[PDB]
Amino acid sequence: MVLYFIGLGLYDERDITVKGMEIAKKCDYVFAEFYTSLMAGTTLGRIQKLIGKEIRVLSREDVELNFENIVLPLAKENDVAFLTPGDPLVATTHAELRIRAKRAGVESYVIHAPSIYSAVGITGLHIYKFGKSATVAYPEGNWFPTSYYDVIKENAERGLHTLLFLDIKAEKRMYMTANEAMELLLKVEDMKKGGVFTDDTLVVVLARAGSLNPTIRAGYVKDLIREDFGDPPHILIVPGKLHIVEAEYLVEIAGAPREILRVNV
Amino acid sequence: MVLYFIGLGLYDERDITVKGMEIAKKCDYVFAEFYTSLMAGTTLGRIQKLIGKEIRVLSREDVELNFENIVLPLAKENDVAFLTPGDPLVATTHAELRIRAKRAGVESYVIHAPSIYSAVGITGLHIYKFGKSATVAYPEGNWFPTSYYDVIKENAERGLHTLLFLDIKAEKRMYMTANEAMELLLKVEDMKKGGVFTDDTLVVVLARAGSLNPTIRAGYVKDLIREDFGDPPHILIVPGKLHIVEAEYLVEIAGAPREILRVNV
Ligand SMILES: Nc1ncnc2c1ncn2[C@@H]1O[C@H](CSCC[C@H](N)C(=O)O)[C@@H](O)[C@H]1O
């Protein structure tokens, strides 16, 4: 009669918390979703071996349309686990799955795990200075979305950092790179002429957060746009005016040019 | 030859990530600090038992003034770990310690852990809608901090949620409750009179995130200001304009007034 929402963390099968691992191990049934994101540093087989359980993967449709027909029935008389990359309920639509559980007379509990929202602290940027967050989406057909650009403008206008999630095609395992995102942003700048993102804009790139060897780079677009940040996933950040302490960390830890100590502080 | 910053998580010792546990288990020396936050569900003994190592707890002074004299010296000839609650680089100034490690010729790595910054997702509020964050600090003598009031104001004008970290005096064992935070906010409201925080302001309280049964409550200040949310730590949130799905969750899961379902578009 219990449903556990368990986060898998940032990168590999060891990014789950001990609490999450032990509880998933005691569950009769274990489901997981990999449509909101992926666990780039591991595989389903590796996650299965860690918790010692068979894992049934669920598609977006399985969850959004039939969660109550696939997961909740079993959770009525057994202990069930629902695994998701990152931290549970940070997805966006998953929170309402708890309401579904309620309607079904099922108890649900949340087992947290690291999320990129907090992991970006490794960039040396103060977490309290982050403003509204956004996602850079791939244009397609006649659709050219640009709202993420206005988000940067509004944040930077208030001296706030902007965390930009990059588009991902989970099912096809396709990731948008920090490079492509910068190209897209420059293209949007050229159309809106707001002076929000140019070759001179200072940006931070965080790749493979959760890994023991993530790529943390900071510098001006003109210099990073064609740099190789390694394998995905990549996270792009457009900082607001920096506190000297933030800048010194980007210089010392992220290889930022000394120039930022006088231009972006 | 290495220093590891390892987060212990939100509430108890099992909130550490498996990665963090495995690494800690093999370190020669393990240091820790328990002043940046409160882990209400465990003890030093249990953490020690989990990683099978003796842990030396440091004070804020030990860290801020003598980190390079107490910890770094040992990291030059051994594998050393530094443990902190939640995520080590979120709402703390520990990032700067990585610069000290560098200047001492010590390589450092960061192992993330569940953080309150992302755990707020359990309140049902969209995490991308959060704006600048702030801290509600205890007034000291004639000094009465009020900047957090302005943060709320700014976010609300943009319709963004505001995450308010609550103060903590570890050595004095003082942990600010959401009730005290609200009292302080009302006082600041009387002084500035900006109509930012009143008895009619909707608020969300999250207490002891990470435990299996955290306290999740939403409602008008007038009704929550005298409510018992249980033992600390507590965190206060002032939502901006709500999306219908956020309202439904607050009502269904956090016992908020049904009237908030009638949003003003
Ligand atoms: N489990 C928990 N539940 C509610 N609030 C919490 C919490 N853990 C931390 N906080 C909040 O955050 C403050 C400490 S700020 C340090 C936060 C830490 N690095 C992290 O990543 O979580 C506390 O005073 C409290 O207001």
Does the distance separating the beta carbons of B95 and A249 come in below 8 Å? yes
- For chain A, residues classed under CATH 3.40.1010.10 are 1-114
Name the amino acid, one letter, at A79: D
CA dist B115 and A121 (Å) reads: 11
Q: Which has the closest alpha carbon to A57: A31, A36, A38, A78?
A: A31
Cα–Cα separations (whole angstroms), residue B205 to A113, A208, B229, B255: 20, 32, 8, 11
- Residues contacting ligand 1 via CB (< 6 Å): A 118; B 10-11, 36-37, 85-87, 90-92, 115-117, 165-166, 168, 206-210, 233-235
Phi, psi values for residue A83, rounded to 5°: -95, 140
Backbone φ and ψ of A261, nearest 5°: -70, -10
Residues forming CATH 3.30.950.10 domain(s) in chain B: 115-265
Q: SS3 for A95?
A: helix
Rounded CA separation B166/B138 (Å): 9
Using an 8 Å Cβ cutoff, are A196 and A156 in contact? yes
**What is the CB neighbour count within 10 angstroms for residue A56?**
12
Angle at A114 between CA A181 and CA A40, to 5 degrees: 50
Query: A99 to chain B nearest CA, in Å?
Result: 7
Q: How far is CA A97 from the centre of its chain?
A: 20
CA distance B45 to B13: 10
DSSP B137: P
| Bridging pattern class, strands A162-166 and B174-175 | unpaired
What are the residues facing B236 on neighbouring strands? B164, B205
CA dihedral A98, A99, A101, A105 (to 10 degrees): 140
Q: Which residues pair with A169 in a beta bridge?
A: A174
- What are phi and psi for residue A43, nearest 5 degrees? -135, 165
Whole-angstrom distance, CA of residue A120 vs CA of residue B112: 10
CATH of domain A1-114: 3.40.1010.10
Handedness of CA B244, B246, B248, B250 (dihedral sign): negative
Burial class of residue A252 (count of CB atoms within 10 Å of its CB; 0-12, 13-18, 19+) = middle
**Optimal mutation site among B17, B99, B167, B252, interface A, most CBs of chain A within 10 A:** B17
Which residue has 């200047």 as its token pair?
Answer: B103
Among A233, A231, A216, CA closest to A86: A233
For residues B51 and B27, give the distance between their C-alpha atoms in angstroms, rounded to a whole number.
10
- Cα–Cα distance between B4 and A67 in angstroms, integer? 40
Q: In the CATH scheme, what is the code of domain B115-265?
A: 3.30.950.10
* A229: Cα within 13 Å, side-chain hemisphere: 32
Determine if residue A112 is labeled as part of a ligand binding site: no
Structure tokens at B142: 């004639």
Q: How far is CA B5 from the centre of its chain?
A: 17
CA of B258 to the centre of ligand 1 (A): 29
Residues 99-138 of A with CB under 8 A from B: 99, 102, 109-110, 112-115, 117-119, 121-122, 124, 127-135
The token duo for B79 is 């594998």
Q: What six digits make up the tokens of B259?
A: 């009237």
Ligand 1 atom nearest the C-alpha of B176 is 24
The rounded distance, in Å, linking the Cα atoms of A29 and A25 is 9
Integer Cα distance of B116 and B99 in angstroms? 25
For residue B165, give both structure tokens.
Answer: 């970290």
- 8 Å CB contact between A166 and A177: yes
> Tokens at residue A48, please?
């299965």
DSSP sequence for B170-238: TTTTEE--HHHHHHHHHHHHHHH--SSS-TT-EEEEEESBTBSS-EEEEEEHHHHTT----SS-EEEEE
Backbone angles phi, psi at A209, to 5 degrees: -60, 140
Phi, psi values for residue A105, rounded to 5°: 75, 30
Q: What is the distance between the alpha carbons of residues A24 and A30, in angstroms, rounded to a whole number?
A: 7
Give me the sign of the Cα torsion angle A186, A250, A120, B4. Answer: positive
Q: How was this structure determined?
A: X-ray
The answer, yes or no, to whether the previous bond of A233 is cis (omega within 30 of 0) is: yes
Q: Which two tokens stand for residue B143?
A: 């000094």
